């Protein structure tokens, strides 16, 4: 059931912005680890005296990394005279965010038809304003409301290249890395209480519910914007990873970004080659019993050779009533056991592929558990 | 003239510690960019609830990257019960350092015979104490005094593997990268006023003077610990890079680390291959006139093919009355135009090679200038 109740016209995920201590080092690490190319910049060399912002892209996936300069460089500025390219940026907010939470996502940005309308409608329907609509070079409008914790939902709308004031990055510094990642599939928040978080976000967006934790998924009309939210379940045998997150993050925040690959086998080969030479590590692989049990579960979707390739790369498989999901999880992206990345590819639900085809892999909690005890034999 | 006036027994450079917002991402970037292997760790997985510290090594070069966790994880600790492996660490100091200066060097660590004596003698001779001598597991003593700005000179002494509480890093996460870097040759500070900085440091160490800026070099008895210091020269045609540093760094601090390579050609080939895929960029190469002029300057030291290899890699060459220096400079290591790295290799002064053989490349300021105007032809 999709009641299509969006209160404003939403298109797709647009970008994810990380708030960093040093944007250069995080961006370079992420570029090599994920196969994303340097696409745009806004920094001292472009006249920005306030913040350094570097954009990585892979396909339609856009990762922005931002860090503040010394406030002294912009001490004579006021908002009407700012050299910042992202007008919502604030030195104190950024330093406080990073001190509190460490490296993590500040903004989940979605493209909308009209950021000013989306902002007004959101706030009229309960959204906590974070940054009012600001028109950039009469070409792009950006606005922000609180999503959960210190994460904002950013609306961006275009009259007609990332943002005004950003410069495209010269060829020599833009190595065309590509490991197959193509778009953001979903972005997941951890909160102390799921009910109030869902009511708030669904309240101001009109997003509907999509068919050690409790979780639920909010979706836009065409179910291409997907925002799962998790709460911890206390008292369990093993401590909830949601609760560990909330402790080390100092509260609610973005838990994982799921990145769709057009070839998850190639993506994982390339990322795993780089794990120990600057890239990302992956969670421990499932036991062989898990891949033995895949024949009964998805033997009609994946061949034996494809199942063996899943085993070689540590890939997990889950299945909907409609589609099949291939997924795998990185270890945390930074010092704290907080944010991590999921790589996914979906098969089925062809009409284009409908959003969320195959689900989110919740069935892999039991399948992993069963395979572990089975393997303990 | 070397009066050998060290006030305590100094051995060699031991390590350099960077204070970071996220140690993981900086360390992984540096590992790939410089060819340094992950050698030791102190973090949540080793029982450290206070800071994350990761050690990279290449030969005798030791780079330590440290970032604070949430203070909440250690709120019940006091110094007598700390889980920090580096007892001088302080959350507030680290966050304030990074907020003020961005990514940069907190500690220049030298190995001494007795860190407690070195500390006492230093302070008795004018050093500003920063952290008193603390004995770690009855095996290692560490102490810190102020060097310049918020950089400390750290003394470490060993009774008889990096520091107690650090764990050696498992093989799988310790890829044996190596681009030829072998040790720290010198560490350079930028200050507003050279005179008072030299008087202070030479005052408490007994280090002697080694034979857009004014600079001088302080050296230990065997001239293996080398600490140049720069001040800006104001009013010049081009703005002093020392002054730009001081503005963007919010004052005095470490300007560059010079890393000795046992094969600077291999090091630069390997680093340049990685510049645009997560590693480090290099300053713009000299014009062809510079390499034409090398024949007259060092044609007795380097063959034509070796001179051409210098041209291929953008390497600079300078000459003492005793030796020859090959050097090259990276672009800044992070967002701010502050700290950068120098790669060097020295030829001559064989006895082992004596310290500072060939000088520090000051002659390359004029040689670059001349070659630029000559090339403008
Ligand atoms: C690392 C680690 C441990 N771990 C996971 O984190 C994990 C995750 C994070 C998902 C997932 O993507 C997801 C959503 O997208 C919305 C629904 C709730 C949720 O959990 C699915 C399976 C997982 N499995 C099996 C697992 O073992
Ligand atoms: C980047 C950039 C511009 N740049 C440098 O920074 C540069 C440096 C930093 C050195 C150097 O190593 C050094 C010392 O070790 C102690 C003495 C003072 C000093 O400067 C030598 C030559 C240099 N040249 C030619 C140059 O062009
Ligand atoms: Co997911
Ligand atoms: Co130097």
Swiss-Prot record, chains A, B:
Main location: cytoplasm
A GO term for molecular function: identical protein binding
EC number: 1.13.11.27
Cofactor note: Binds 1 Fe cation per subunit.
Pfam families: Glyoxalase (PF00903)
Pathway the protein acts in: Amino-acid degradation; L-phenylalanine degradation; acetoacetate and fumarate from L-phenylalanine: step 3/6; Cofactor biosynthesis; prenylquinone biosynthesis
Cofactor(s) listed: Fe cation
Transmembrane segments: none
Residues binding Fe cation: 186, 256, 342
Keywords for this protein: Cytoplasm, Dioxygenase, Iron, Metal-binding, Oxidoreductase, Phenylalanine catabolism, Repeat, Tyrosine catabolism
GO biological-process terms attached to the record: L-phenylalanine catabolic process; tyrosine catabolic process
Xref: InterPro entries: 4OHPhenylPyrv_dOase (IPR005956), 4OHPhenylPyrv_dOase_C (IPR041735), 4OHPhenylPyrv_dOase_N (IPR041736), Glyas_Bleomycin-R_OHBP_Dase (IPR029068), Glyas_Fos-R_dOase_dom (IPR004360), VOC (IPR037523)
Catalytic activity: 3-(4-hydroxyphenyl)pyruvate + O2 = homogentisate + CO2
A single cellular component GO annotation: cytoplasm
Cell location: Cytoplasm
Family of the protein in this entry: Belongs to the 4HPPD family.
Assembly with partners or alone: Homodimer.
Classification via NCBIfam families: 4HPPD
Biological function: Catalyzes the conversion of 4-hydroxyphenylpyruvic acid to homogentisic acid, one of the steps in tyrosine catabolism.
Protein known as: 4-hydroxyphenylpyruvate dioxygenase
Species the sequence originates in: Arabidopsis thaliana (Mouse-ear cress)
Taxonomic lineage of the native organism: Eukaryota, Viridiplantae, Streptophyta, Embryophyta, Tracheophyta
